[PDB]
Design an enzyme around this catalytic site. Structure first.
Site, PDB file in Angstrom:
ATOM      1  N   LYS A  79       6.190  17.585   3.266  1.00  0.00           N
ATOM      2  CA  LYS A  79       6.256  17.277   4.702  1.00  0.00           C
ATOM      3  C   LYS A  79       6.862  15.902   5.000  1.00  0.00           C
ATOM      4  O   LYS A  79       6.874  15.498   6.156  1.00  0.00           O
ATOM      5  CB  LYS A  79       4.863  17.415   5.341  1.00  0.00           C
ATOM      6  N   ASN A  80       7.409  15.194   3.997  1.00  0.00           N
ATOM      7  CA  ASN A  80       8.032  13.892   4.232  1.00  0.00           C
ATOM      8  C   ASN A  80       9.508  14.143   4.676  1.00  0.00           C
ATOM      9  O   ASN A  80      10.159  15.039   4.154  1.00  0.00           O
ATOM     10  CB  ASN A  80       7.901  13.031   2.952  1.00  0.00           C
TER      11      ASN A  80
END
Ligand SMILES: Cc1nn(C)c(C)c1C(=O)N1CCN(Cc2nc3ccccc3n2CC(C)(C)C)CC1
Ligand SMILES: [Mg+2]
Ligand SMILES: [Zn+2]
Lengths: 404, 313
Positions: free
Chosen positions: B109-110
């Protein structure tokens, strides 16, 4: 009976999986079971429900975080102007004053984050980026002193925005970075507040944002992408700043956002068939005042003169009963850890749910004890309406910068 | 030396780093939102600040950026300097693809990790590992927004359209409620054949109606049926109303009732037959939705009801 989430008929709003189980229905049922245990807790313990916003607990958590954080916040070492904004904005919502010495300390720290070529970085000496630039300008406008306004190098901020502008209308988030709808909102937000909008700065921007509206009615990060509440907020708020809201199909957008409120939980989901989440109390509910203003500008005679087009009561009950940490701070949903991001947006969403306003009509809905009433928030900038007027009035007394 | 290795040593205790002075962070004399960094984080970032201030384009600085990234993968300043070093040092970019593959698996999710992967793919002009890598991330989280964005980017940029409708069909069988997959279906069809082809539109509406019959309370299928027909106007399809009214007794839902109001809205805006009858049916359904079947949206259905009266009376 006064609490909508506790009425007997509310049990009929539980998920109907049609006897077909998938990962989506299993995770949704797990959350609904956990949320129902929270709603039924007053009945099981034999107490009258008393929805209280834990102001003093939230205040202790915020004033401490404003000064210092543990190594657990190392993941936020490139988001320190965001921590300034989330904390100062939660404190303004809670009607907590910022001491003059603390306000000066924030101004000086944001000066260290400012780049010599314009914009702000996530910390001292970090390269500029539109997300911490948006957060630093909003933080300085919440302070709203001459010292705070003077921090912003308006000539270099304008040069910086031009260096990110693309021929197709979009903006890069940073040099050698990527484009998304947030960047157009970050640029329109800071450029309007500081009065640096030139005639061609946002040429094509409205048309590029409109391409991000998809078949669902909402807006994705870039064209082709699934509709998402955060990007939809950014998209519509940017178009409200540019006065180009009519570039979107506002009716398919209205139908999409109203569908994101969860019939059982009362809170909002970020995307269709995903879980409820406290931060979308702002990103999604914040769209209803923007849509009300857009439709009102077109002379729509069917609009309400007292309420937003979402269940204001049920959103307040979700935030007050399911999103407060007992030690202070707010959260996504029960079982999750608190953070300054969810403290900011749960309280911002709660404030939109309490305060309606359109033309000469004002109407408040304050669920729970009367002391739960928060200070209002501007649906475009998500800072106090007073701070928006003070900043725009200050910067309108300066000319729009020229080119070097 | 890995950052999590039991024999990891601080940079200040490393012999090959003894020539450079660490540069501490300047937070001011009265600091705000100050993170009390652990010794390990502070040590790496004080040495990163030193190599960045002097622009040391060396192999040791390249290995140091890996540690700085593992401590805070959102530090976009470190990612930029890593890309400067990849090109200045002529680093094997396939070894860098192996590294970015591993860190995306750890932090899917970065944002920064996905942007780095796209730069590597653009630099190498090689999308041959992408669809399989993204399918592995989607096998763990089938709704990851960054993974779907990267997938759309690869398909558009390198014209990899041929097998995506088949992949979409596979994930809809796994979870027909995955809205990200219904979006991918629209993304593929609108960019290949389009929806103007009557055979394609007929196949899509027949497929969607079968999914609605199987799982009547799945909102994504209802939203996809509406989205592909709303362009030209729901009233343009006269059999649709009676086919939904036939499914009303056994497969009813507030989604079916809302779709009936959407059909009546367009019929009224296009000069339909029995105009007085159509408005009353629409207002009656708005009342049932506001007071009973969809009370969370009472203000929306009351607005629609008033809106219809204002326009068509
Ligand atoms: C928390 C956190 N934890 N970590 C590890 C990090 C790096 C953070 C952080 O710094 N964040 C969270 C993500 N947002 C993305 C984002 N930029 C925006 C700019 C303007 C308006 C909204 C914006 N949104 C939010 C969404 C639209 C995506 C909902 C930036 C701030
Ligand atoms: Mg980046
Ligand atoms: Zn959230």
């Amino acid at each position: 009976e006064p609490l909508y989430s506790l009425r007997p008929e509310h049990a009929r709003e539980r998920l109907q999986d049609d006897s077909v189980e998938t990962v989506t229905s299993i995770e949704q049922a797990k959350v609904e079971e956990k949320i129902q245990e929270v709603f039924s807790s007053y009945k099981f313990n034999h107490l009258v429900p008393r929805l209280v916003l834990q102001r003093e607990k939230h205040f202790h958590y915020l004033k401490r975080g404003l000064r210092q954080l543990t190594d657990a916040y190392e993941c936020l070492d490139a988001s320190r102007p965001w921590l300034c904004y989330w904390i100062l904005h939660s404190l303004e919502l809670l009607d907590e004053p910022i001491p003059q010495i603390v306000a000066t300390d924030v101004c000086q720290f944001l000066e260290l984050c400012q780049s010599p070529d314009g914009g702000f970085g996530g910390g001292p000496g970090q390269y500029p980026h539109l997300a911490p630039t948006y957060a630093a300008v909003n933080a300085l406008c919440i302070i709203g002193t001459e010292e705070a306004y003077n921090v912003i190098n308006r000539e270099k901020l304008l040069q910086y925005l031009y260096s990110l502008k693309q021929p197709d209308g979009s903006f890069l988030m940073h040099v050698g970075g990527e484009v998304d709808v947030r960047s157009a909102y970050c640029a329109a937000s800071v450029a309007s507040l500081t009065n640096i909008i030139t005639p061609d700065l946002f040429e094509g921007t409205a048309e590029w944002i409109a391409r991000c509206q998809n078949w669902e009615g909402g807006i994705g990060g870039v064209p082709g992408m699934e509709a998402h509440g955060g990007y939809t907020f950014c998209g519509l708020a940017a178009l409200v700043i540019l006065k180009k809201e009519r570039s979107l199909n506002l009716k398919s957008l209205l139908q999409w956002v109203t569908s994101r409120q969860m019939r059982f939980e009362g809170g909002f989901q970020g995307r269709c068939n995903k879980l409820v989440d406290g931060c979308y109390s702002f990103w999604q509910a914040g769209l209803l005042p923007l849509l009300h203003r857009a439709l009102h500008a077109q002379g729509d005679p069917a609009l309400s003169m007292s309420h937003w087009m979402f269940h204001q009561q049920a959103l307040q009950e979700y935030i007050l009963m399911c999103c407060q940490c007992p030690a202070g701070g707010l959260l996504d949903k029960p079982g999750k850890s608190r953070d300054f991001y969810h403290t900011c947006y749960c309280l911002s969403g709660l404030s939109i749910a309490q305060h309606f306003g359109s033309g000469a009509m004002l109407h408040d809905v304050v669920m729970g004890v009367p002391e739960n009433v928060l200070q209002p928030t501007h649906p475009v900038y998500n800072i106090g309406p007073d701070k928006v007027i003070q900043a725009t009035t200050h910067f309108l007394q300066k000319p729009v910068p020229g080119f070097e | 030396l890995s950052l999590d290795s039991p024999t990891y040593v601080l940079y200040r205790d490393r012999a090959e780093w003894a020539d450079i002075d660490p540069v501490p962070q300047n937070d001011g004399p009265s600091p705000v939102v100050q993170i009390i960094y652990s010794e390990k984080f502070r040590d790496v970032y004080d040495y990163f600040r030193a190599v960045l201030q002097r622009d040391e384009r060396s192999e040791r600085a390249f290995k140091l950026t890996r540690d700085a990234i593992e401590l805070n993968a959102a530090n976009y300043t470190v990612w930029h300097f890593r890309r400067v070093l990849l090109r200045s040092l002529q680093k094997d970019l396939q070894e860098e693809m192996n590294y970015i593959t591993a860190i995306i698996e750890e932090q899917p999710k970065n944002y920064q990790v996905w942007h780095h992967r796209r730069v590597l793919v653009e630099w190498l002009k090689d999308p041959s590992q992408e669809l399989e890598f993204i399918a592995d991330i989607l096998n763990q989280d089938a709704k990851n927004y960054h993974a779907w964005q990267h997938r759309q980017w690869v398909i558009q940029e390198f014209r990899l359209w041929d097998n995506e409708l088949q992949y979409v069909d596979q994930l809809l069988k796994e979870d027909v409620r995955n809205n990200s997959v219904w979006n991918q279906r629209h993304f593929v069809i609108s960019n290949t054949t389009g929806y103007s082809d009557r055979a394609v539109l007929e196949r899509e509406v027949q497929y969607t109606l079968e999914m609605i019959k199987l799982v009547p309370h799945n909102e994504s299928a209802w939203n996809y049926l509406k989205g592909i027909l709303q362009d030209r106007g729901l009233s343009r399809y006269p059999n649709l109303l009676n086919q939904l009214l036939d499914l009303q007794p056994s497969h009813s839902s507030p989604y079916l009732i809302a779709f009936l109001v959407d059909i009546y809205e367009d019929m009224l805006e296009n000069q339909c037959d029995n105009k007085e009858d159509i408005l009353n049916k629409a207002l009656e359904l708005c009342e049932i939705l506001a007071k009973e079947k969809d009370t969370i949206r009472k203000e929306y259905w009351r607005y629609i009801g008033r809106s219809l009266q204002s326009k068509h009376s």
